[PDB]
Paper text:
Finally, the CDPME2P is converted into MEcDP with concomitant release of CMP by MEcDP synthase (IspF). In this study, crystal structures of BsIspF in native and complexed with CMP have been determinated both at 1.99-Å resolutions. The monomer displays an α/β fold constructed with a four-strand β-sheet of β1, β2, β3, and β4, with β2 antiparallel to the others on one side, and a three-helix bundle of α1 to α3 on the other. In BsIspF trimer, the four-strand β-sheet of each subunit lay roughly parallel to the threefold NCS axis, forming a compact bell-shaped trimer of approximately 45 × 60 Å in the axial and equatorial dimensions, respectively.
The crystallographic asymmetric unit contains six monomers, which are arranged as two trimers of closely associated subunits. Overall, the two trimers are extremely similar with a root mean square deviation (r.m.s.d) value of 0.20 Å over all Cα atoms. Both loops are parts of the active pocket and involved in the binding of 2-C-methyl-d-erythritol (MEPP) moiety. However, although the accessible surface area (ASA) of a BsIspF monomer (7584 Å2) is nearly the same as ASA of EcIspF monomer (7681Å2), the ASA of the BsIspF trimer (17966 Å2), is larger than that of EcIspF trimer (16293 Å2), which demonstrates a looser packing of the subunits of BsIspF. Compared with the structure of EcIspF, there is also a hydrophobic cavity along the three-fold symmetry axis of BsIspF homotrimer. The volume of the cavity of BsIspF (1024Å3) is larger than that of EcIspF (718Å3), which is consistent with the looser packing of the subunits in BsIspF.
Author numbering:
A (entry chain B): 1 to 135, 144 to 158
B (entry chain C), C (entry chain A): 1 to 158
């Protein structure tokens, strides 16, 4: 058995907050707006994993209104989501993710995002793909995941 | 043997139509514009299914020109599409779907959509995921001009 | 083993360039803007394929700044990508693609794009699905600024 999931998120850009994407802090004048660290890539990854196993989305498991998830580290939240997936008997097949952002340039941080995502999904880096495009009020991300019994 | 499909659709919100999403009636003062009931989520589920078996899209099977599909029930269209998938030898593995909408809030109706989609794919509700998110006021859906959806389906021999 | 990949791309329609989509030249007033032939659909197919094997995106293999990307034939680029997939031991499961464009009407060329993509992926036409949808006048594609495409691929050991 394999199962498929998909995630899509957008976060608003704003001054004063730090920019964190795929678990990596990126030097920039504007961070993303959110109640947790607002890592839009790790949120999308988490939502794709939740969706593959039929467990709604991260809003359902870590609500915005829950003070416990104020300034939450989104890598920790991904680890908990991955606990839910493992409990259903699944491991990672592979994941393919896209960051949509006009600025900053993501290329110098992509390889550490992949390591970080792999770590959070307990997989090898060869199972994780991250790309960026630009095509500027926010940063979006999309992810598609295939999980397998294991 | 597994096959993947993907659907993407977007409908304009207007005054003076019902809002029907995922086969569920949502009491709301705007609804979706289209030749059929405009059910954006069932259209993307149906497109994902047709995509997975190489049978085009709903436009091919139920065109806007042909007048007989005027105000058609999108649940009924989904069942006809599911008939095509079954004839090819496939059943549902699982489906993950996203509604993209600033308003209204979808969360009270999610479980019902999942039930209705499960019924249309002849599947267990554990096989169907539906989530709703906003674009944080950004874009055509962010400013309530329309509702978008996406769906990704995995089907398997059965 | 099966692997999944996803691609997404958007290109501007501009005056006096050919419109090449899915490897097929379509008669039209405008073409897509880019360094290569700007075939938005073959770019997304290529990206989905590279994504499935963890090899980045077309920009990693054929940067904009590479003089052989200038006016490159995106079908040849797809064949290069497919060689990468084949060296890892995979063949096509199936692919489902969507062209989002307000105009022109894709429907007369779809079958040819399917055959071309099938040829590039060394597969049967039954494994390739391509659908075309308009945006209902909404967004950047809805206001004829461009053409968008998405593709989801399932590959398998072969
Ligand atoms: Mg988020
Ligand atoms: Mg529709
Ligand atoms: Mg391109």
């Amino acid at each position: 058995m394999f199962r498929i999931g998909q995630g899509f998120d957008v976060h608003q850009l704003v001054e004063g907050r730090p920019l964190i994407i795929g678990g990596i802090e990126i030097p920039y004048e504007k961070g993303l707006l959110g109640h947790s660290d607002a890592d839009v890539l790790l949120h999308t990854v988490a939502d794709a994993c939740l969706g593959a196993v039929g467990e709604g989305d991260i809003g359902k498991h870590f609500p915005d209104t829950d003070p416990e998830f104020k300034d939450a580290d989104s890598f920790k939240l991904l680890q908990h989501v991955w606990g839910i997936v493992k409990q259903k008997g699944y491991v990672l097949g592979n994941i393919d993710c896209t960051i949509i952002a006009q600025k900053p340039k993501m290329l110098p941080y992509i390889e550490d995002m992949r390591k970080r995502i792999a770590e959070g999904l307990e997989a090898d880096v060869s199972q994780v793909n991250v790309k960026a495009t630009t095509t500027a009020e926010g940063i979006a991300a999309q992810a598609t995941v295939l999980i397998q019994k294991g």
